[PDB]
Swiss-Prot record, chain A:
PTM field: N-terminally acetylated by acetyltransferase NatA.
Keyword Chloroplast: no
Domain of life: Eukaryota
Principal location listed in the UniProt entry: cytoplasm
Keywords per UniProt: Acetylation, Cytoplasm, Ribonucleoprotein, Ribosomal protein, Ribosome biogenesis, rRNA processing
Any one GO cellular component localisation term in the record: cytoplasmic stress granule
Localisation per UniProt entry: Cytoplasm
Subunit structure: Component of the small ribosomal subunit (SSU). Mature yeast ribosomes consist of a small (40S) and a large (60S) subunit. The 40S small subunit contains 1 molecule of ribosomal RNA (18S rRNA) and 33 different proteins (encoded by 57 genes). The large 60S subunit contains 3 rRNA molecules (25S, 5.8S and 5S rRNA) and 46 different proteins (encoded by 81 genes).
Phenotype seen when the gene is deleted: Reduction in growth rate, a decrease in free 40S subunits, an increase in the amount of free 60S subunits and a decrease in polysome size.
Protein name: Small ribosomal subunit protein uS2A
Parent-protein start and end of this portion: 2 to 207 of 252
Organism encoding this protein: Saccharomyces cerevisiae (strain ATCC 204508 / S288c) (Baker's yeast)
Gene that encodes it: RPS0A
Swiss-Prot record, chain E:
Gene Ontology cellular-component terms listed: cytosol; cytosolic small ribosomal subunit
Pfam families assigned: Ribosomal_S21e
Protein name: Small ribosomal subunit protein eS21A
Organism whose genome encodes this protein: Saccharomyces cerevisiae (strain ATCC 204508 / S288c)
Name of the gene this protein is made from: RPS21A
Transmembrane annotation, as ranges: none
Organism phylogeny: Eukaryota, Fungi, Dikarya, Ascomycota, Saccharomycotina
UniProtKB/Swiss-Prot annotation, chain F:
Naturally occurring in which organism (per UniProt): Saccharomyces cerevisiae (strain ATCC 204508 / S288c)
Name by which UniProt lists this protein: Small ribosomal subunit protein uS12A
Parent-record interval covered: 2 to 97 of 145
Modified residues (3,4-dihydroxyproline): P63
Cystine pairs: none
Cross-linked residues, Glycyl lysine isopeptide (Lys-Gly) (interchain with G-Cter in ubiquitin): K55
Similarity-based family: Belongs to the universal ribosomal protein uS12 family.
Gene: RPS23A
From Swiss-Prot, chain G:
PROSITE patterns: RIBOSOMAL_S5, S5_DSRBD
Alphabetical GO biological process terms: cytoplasmic translation; positive regulation of translational fidelity; ribosomal subunit export from nucleus; rRNA processing; translation
Compartment annotation: Cytoplasm; Nucleus, Nucleolus
S5 DRBM domain span: 43-106
GO CC annotations, alphabetized: cytoplasm; cytosol; cytosolic small ribosomal subunit; nucleolus; nucleoplasm; small-subunit processome
Record function comment: Component of the ribosome, a large ribonucleoprotein complex responsible for the synthesis of proteins in the cell. The small ribosomal subunit (SSU) binds messenger RNAs (mRNAs) and translates the encoded message by selecting cognate aminoacyl-transfer RNA (tRNA) molecules. The large subunit (LSU) contains the ribosomal catalytic site termed the peptidyl transferase center (PTC), which catalyzes the formation of peptide bonds, thereby polymerizing the amino acids delivered by tRNAs into a polypeptide chain.
Protein name as catalogued: Small ribosomal subunit protein uS5
Lineage: Eukaryota, Fungi, Dikarya, Ascomycota, Saccharomycotina
Gene field: RPS2
Length: 206, 121, 129, 94, 87, 96, 216, 25, 81
RNA sequence: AGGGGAUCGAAGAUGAUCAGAUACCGUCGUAGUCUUAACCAUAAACUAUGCCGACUAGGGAUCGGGUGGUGUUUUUUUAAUGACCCACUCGGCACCUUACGAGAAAUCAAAGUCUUUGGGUUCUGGGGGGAGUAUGGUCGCAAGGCUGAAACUUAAAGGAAUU
């Protein structure tokens, strides 16, 4: 089991609940997300922090499981997370792609758009449904960032968070960047935090 | 039909991504410089490639656009020069009086009990 | 209406495997159903099932396994002779190495091979494999 | 064959039939559920309202419109240029 | 399978799904293999130990694998409160 | 379900339903109604002798423009006018 | 040297993989043709027939030819390919070039006492491609193969020697019957048999073990 | 192959045949 | 989800669905005791009366028929039983 | 067979257009369109999908009822009622995204749980014409309805989508 070093520490919790990521989707709920937690009035939902963090360290374990970080690919067609993908591409291999995800990235064995991944991550399955659908044609497991009403089908690991909030998507991308570095051995300072802060992964209008 | 074709367009952005800081807004020296780049057969086409190349160079002066890479689109200088916009974002701001007054949150999440006010509505 | 209690219980089993569930709610918990579900554990085909009883009819909660392929009930109540059991398993059974079409004689409920051992024949309910 | 529901009639009752208004293609509509095209066109068309406002003996007042609930466009409004023939993107609205 | 006197047969013995315990096809392109690391109280996961759970194409199709990997992880001991069998 | 009854003591219901259904066969119907016996000019006979009375020049259907040189033959036991066709070439003068 | 631009092609080039059992076991995708023929160079090939099909244009008739072909050796392995080309010479090579990709193994079982070598399927299987379905029944020893000549050669090159066959619908559609039979012999391995009831170690994929031979 | 008008003609033929039958009986 | 606890479901979910759809049969109706002001006159009134019951003293109707429960009178001290 | 008979209006009388128009187009116009007592027992009478019972991916809106939340309102803020909010339930008419499954496809939460074939039951059809025709019965004032062939002829009729 875990050595109890991945518990809900205050330092990773203060920034987690200061970015309104605890809120979920509207009254519409999917049974793939049983994380409902005393739903708040006005129709908005509230997710429980413990399961999100526990599955987030599990998701980071998936990325650290691969021997070659190059095959790790992150898919993001939404404009908020485009800068997050290219920024995550520097700390590790993390072969990035932003903007319009080209169709047939894994297939079409002659095109210059060749991709040979093992793990691919999608920030929002509703917009990047093509990548997840294609990932089921080349036998590649997928990780997804799913809210309480997102189309979470075709998903192995779902990270419950808010994909509509600007801070939340960049926040979760930052945490998984830390943990994958921590389990890879690059971040020896397990107790000490990471120098770069979360709003690094923030797209801006200019 | 005064419309450009991909024949002059494929050669143009190829010139920009590799031979940008050679040319200028000038026209006739752009024609002369085209001789000093990869050989092109027809002089009639040279009249159009020089005319096109300055056309993008008027557009870039009022804001660079997609499809061009002359090492300043690849500026990559601290992302968008904001790199780490810390300015004590995870403290200060509202943390001086402590932020996140909230409602029905970690105050009722029994995993752990953290600080900050928990009474708003 | 509720003509064959075996139809709903065995059919409600059939849908639940092809959708990959883990448990099934079964009604109305008759004596011929509870014995039907009783002869799989000794053959390791369903696992364990629970009998929650109310005064009217009771309910069965079946905890199943993925080793099962398909089960059904042959309607109506067909008459089987000693020269018919081998005919039936050669008709609606994929093979004899696996799968046991079951039937009941005067001495309770058994399977085709077990009834072949009985030297006697009897009444047929359905097939399990 | 297209047109699963044809119109919005799923229940029963058959309603009734009303005469079609100034079409020259009047017929028995398949129940009251047709293309409507309700019109709130003004009694006075745009422009030339400045003359009416000045010529009014009393100031302000007036400016109402014609309130005509129409049921005239049924299976022939293509001649009248009201209902547009479409394709498999007809899933919009009903 | 095995016949009487040995002579191991049934080439290409397939893996069984770890979610609902059914077989998968060799041409089934919707089935994936997921490996989970293990950190031995040092802060970084040691490679070489990867528990392999078989996810069939059917559980992928229904989109239940997202709420399934927590079931098997908690049973192994990798998760504590993510999975609750009670409903 | 599935239409026909599946009752243990329902045998006579789908037995008679079977009888009405097989009544629709081309084979079942004319086998008992005796159409080959009361309407056919052979009386259930594979072959029959007859007497040729005159010849015919019936044409063909589309797209063939030809005549088969048919002949008219009268039976003995039954006695109705019947048309016959000459099988091979040159046999018309042998069946004149 | 065929300069494999994919990942599996490099593995088969390095010689780490010597048989196609494990790639079938792990269901990893195959998009390259040579792996099947290099690993199995003794397979036999034959063409059923040629179906002329045309697409109507404004002027004249623009006609192609439909070609289907079965690949696979006489030992449990068989594949099919469906394709059409502007000429019959390239149709057969275009038929086989994609037929090697869809090669699937067989579930050869026994009919009684499991004494000798495998001869028939271990279970009855079905396959529905369109409105035509095929029912395959295990056959006794030496019973031979009972099927139409169009499909009976599928069983002969599939490694099986005696299977009872039943069909429904119009069987004159050769390409539908061929694919319906193919779906059937792929679903026969989808039957869970008590011999597989025992759990398995679930071995890891060789791609992860041999990931050091990538492009860079 | 207009069903309604050929059907009406069939009833006219029915009328005529009934009249012919009623002529004798 | 394929694993659910129908044997021991959460009481919140059990007490929410329709009674005929629960694990075991149980009515949601309950009895109660109400006093007419003045004399005690111990009586028990069932919530779904569909009637205008009154105490043995005089016409002291405490509940009125209604489609659901019985609408108690303004002056009533009812205790859960 | 009576009452009524305003509009529309099978027939019909006229004026067009048309080579021809007792058709489309304009105006009149009988029966009829309404009701009474008694017949007629028919339709694309269609959801072209029988009835009863059970299970199966979700969501939202809606009709009727009910439950809980000091819910927001209505006064004599407040007692109540009723209008609505939130959460849910039963019975429905039904929708939206997908297809585990079926279907030849159009598509279907059933047209799924059918070769891995069997929950109970009723009715209908075995190529297209002939023909819903002949005759025989039966009901009806009539018009017509129910049951219902044969002789003879053909290798094609028919269904979904493609260029």
């Amino acid at each position: 089991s875990l050595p109890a070093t991945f518990d809900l520490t205050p330092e990773d919790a203060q920034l987690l609940l200061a970015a309104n990521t605890h809120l979920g989707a509207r009254n519409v709920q999917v049974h793939q997300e049983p994380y409902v937690f005393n739903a708040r009035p006005d129709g908005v939902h509230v997710i429980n922090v413990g399961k999100t963090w526990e599955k987030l360290v599990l998701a980071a374990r998936i990325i650290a499981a691969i021997p070659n970080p190059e095959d790790v690919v992150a898919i993001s067609s939404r404009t908020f997370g485009q800068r997050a993908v290219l920024k995550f591409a520097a700390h590790t291999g993390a072969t990035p792609i932003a903007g319009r995800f080209t169709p047939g990235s894994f297939t079409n064995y002659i095109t210059r758009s060749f991709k040979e991944p093992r793990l691919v991550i999608v920030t929002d399955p509703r917009s990047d449904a093509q990548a997840i659908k294609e990932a089921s044609y080349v036998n590649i497991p997928v990780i997804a960032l799913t809210d309480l009403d997102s189309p979470s089908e075709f998903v192995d690991v779902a990270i419950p968070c808010n994909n509509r909030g600007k801070h939340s998507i960049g926040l979760i991308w930052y945490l998984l960047a830390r943990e994958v570095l921590r389990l890879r051995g690059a971040l020896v300072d397990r107790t000490q935090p990471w120098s770069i802060m979360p709003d690094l992964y923030f797209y801006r209008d200019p | 039909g005064r419309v450009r074709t991909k024949t002059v367009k494929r050669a143009s952005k190829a010139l920009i991504e590799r031979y940008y800081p050679k040319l200028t807004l000038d026209f006739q020296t752009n024609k002369r410089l085209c001789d000093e780049i990869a050989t092109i057969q027809s002089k009639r086409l040279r009249n159009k490639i020089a005319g096109y190349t300055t056309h993008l160079m008027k557009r870039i002066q009022k804001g660079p656009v997609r499809g061009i890479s002359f090492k300043l689109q690849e500026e990559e200088r601290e992302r968008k020069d904001q790199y780490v916009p810390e300015v004590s974002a995870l403290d200060l701001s509202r943390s001086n009086g402590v932020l996140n007054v909230d409602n029905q949150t970690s105050d009722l999440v029994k995993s752990l009990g953290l600080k900050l006010p928990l009474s708003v509505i | 209406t509720r003509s064959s209690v075996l139809a709903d219980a065995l059919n409600a089993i059939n849908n639940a495997e092809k959708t990959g569930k883990r448990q099934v709610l079964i009604r109305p918990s008759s004596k011929v159903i509870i014995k039907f579900l009783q002869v799989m554990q000794k053959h390791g085909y369903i696992g364990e099932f629970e009998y929650i009883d109310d005064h009217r009819s009771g309910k069965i909660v079946v905890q199943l396994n993925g080793r099962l392929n398909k089960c059904g009930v042959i309607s109506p109540r067909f008459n089987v002779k000693i020269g018919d059991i081998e005919k039936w398993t050669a008709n609606l059974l994929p093979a004899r190495q696996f799968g046991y079409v079951i039937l009941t004689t005067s001495a309770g409920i058994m399977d085709h091979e077990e009834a072949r051992r009985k030297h006697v024949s009897g009444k047929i309910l359905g097939f399990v494999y | 064959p297209k047109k699963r529901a044809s119109n919005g009639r799923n229940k029963k009752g058959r309603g009734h039939v009303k005469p079609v208004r100034c079409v020259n293609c009047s017929k028995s509509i398949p129940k009251d559920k047709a293309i409507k095209r309700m019109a709130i066109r003004n009694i006075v068309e745009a422009a030339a309202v400045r003359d009416l406002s000045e010529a009014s003996v009393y100031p302000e007042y007036a400016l109402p419109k014609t309130y005509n609930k129409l049921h005239y466009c049924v299976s022939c409004a293509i001649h009248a240029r009201i209902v547009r023939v479409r394709s498999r993107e007809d899933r919009k609205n009903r | 399978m095995e016949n009487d006197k040995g002579q191991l047969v049934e080439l290409y013995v397939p893996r069984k799904c770890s979610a609902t315990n059914r077989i998968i096809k060799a041409d089934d392109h919707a089935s994936v293999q997921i490996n989970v690391a293990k950190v031995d109280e040092e802060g970084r996961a040691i490679p070489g130990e990867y528990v392999t759970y078989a996810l069939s194409g059917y559980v992928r199709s229904r989109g239940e694998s997202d709420d399934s990997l927590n079931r098997l992880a908690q049973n192994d001991g990798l998760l504590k409160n993510v999975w609750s069998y009670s409903r | 379900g599935k239409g026909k009854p599946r009752g243990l003591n329902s045998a006579r219901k789908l037995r008679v339903h079977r009888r009405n259904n097989r009544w629709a066969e081309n084979n079942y119907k004319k086998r008992l109604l005796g159409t080959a016996f009361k309407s056919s000019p052979f009386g259930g006979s594979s072959h029959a002798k007859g007497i040729v009375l005159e010849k015919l020049g019936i044409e063909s259907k589309q797209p063939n423009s030809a005549i088969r040189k048919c002949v008219r033959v009268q039976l003995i036991k039954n006695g109705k006018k019947v048309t016959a066709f000459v099988p091979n070439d040159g046999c018309l003068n042998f069946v004149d | 040297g065929w300069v494999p631009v994919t990942k599996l092609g490099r593995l088969v080039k390095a010689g780490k993989i010597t048989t196609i059992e494990e790639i079938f076991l792990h269901s990893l995708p195959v998009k390259e043709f040579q792996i099947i023929d290099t690993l199995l160079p003794g397979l036999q090939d034959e063409v059923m027939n040629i179906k002329p099909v045309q697409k109507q244009t404004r002027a004249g008739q623009r006609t192609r030819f439909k070609a289907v072909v079965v690949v696979g050796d006489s030992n449990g392995h068989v594949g099919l390919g469906i394709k059409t080309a502007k000429e019959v010479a390239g149709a057969i090579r275009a038929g086989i070039i994609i037929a090697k990709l869809s090669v699937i193994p067989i579930r050869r079982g026994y009919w009684g006492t499991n004494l000798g070598q495998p001869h028939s399927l271990a279970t009855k299987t079905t396959g529905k491609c369109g409105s035509v379905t095929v029912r395959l029944i295990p056959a006794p020893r030496g019973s031979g193969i009972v099927a139409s000549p169009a499909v009976k050669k599928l069983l002969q090159l599939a490694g099986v020697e005696d299977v009872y066959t039943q069909s429904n619908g119009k069987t004159r559609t050769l390409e539908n019957t061929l694919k319906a039979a193919f779906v059937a012999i792929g679903n026969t391995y989808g039957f869970l048999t008590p011999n597989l009831w025992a759990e398995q170690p679930l071995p890891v994929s060789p791609l992860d073990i041999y990931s050091d031979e990538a492009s860079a | 192959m207009r069903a309604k008008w050929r059907k009406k003609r069939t009833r006219r033929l029915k009328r005529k045949r009934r009249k012919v039958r009623a002529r004798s009986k | 989800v394929l694993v659910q606890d129908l044997l021991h479901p959460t009481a919140a979910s059990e007490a929410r669905k329709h009674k005929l759809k629960t694990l075991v049969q149980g009515p949601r109706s309950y009895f109660l005791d109400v006093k007419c002001p003045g004399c005690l006159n111990i009586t028990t009134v069932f919530s779904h009366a569909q009637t205008a019951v009154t105490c043995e003293s005089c016409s002291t109707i405490l509940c009125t028929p209604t489609g659901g429960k019985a609408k108690l009178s303004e002056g009533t001290s009812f205790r859960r039983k």
